[PDB]
Amino acid sequence: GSSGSSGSREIDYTAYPWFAGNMERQQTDNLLKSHASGTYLIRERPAEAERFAISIKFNDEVKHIKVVEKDNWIHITEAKKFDSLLELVEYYQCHSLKESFKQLDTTLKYPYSGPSSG
């Protein structure tokens, strides 16, 4: 129960096309693997502290990153703080993910499968 900090309106991550939510892991590596070497997506995980994740298809291998939410902040591997998930995404969207993971060098290019209605 964070005391002092309040929240009037939180950013809706489920409004973006690159939003996946609580999809099926296997489904992620099944749809991503097929996608191109630039398909990224953001999924959520059943946890109090870590309730966010990011999966991007790069190097013929689907990588799954974990998000940490502490002190009303959102970041990964405590390498860089961001006002919120949105920021963290917009950051890599242009800056390669090498900074956090050398082995991984890419930037959110295209979204995931996408919500196909109809």
Swiss-Prot record:
Widely expressed. Phosphorylated on tyrosine residues in response to FGR activation. Residues 18-112 form the SH2 domain. Transmembrane segments: none annotated. Guanine nucleotide exchange factor for the Rho family of Ras-related GTPases. Plays an important role in angiogenesis. Its recruitment by phosphorylated EPHA2 is critical for EFNA1-induced RAC1 GTPase activation and vascular endothelial cell migration and assembly. Interacts (via SH2 domains) with the phosphorylated form of EPHA2. Interacts with SSX2IP. Interacts with NEK3 and PRLR and this interaction is prolactin-dependent. This is Guanine nucleotide exchange factor VAV2. It comes from Homo sapiens. The gene is VAV2. The chain holds residues 663 to 767 of 878 of the full protein.
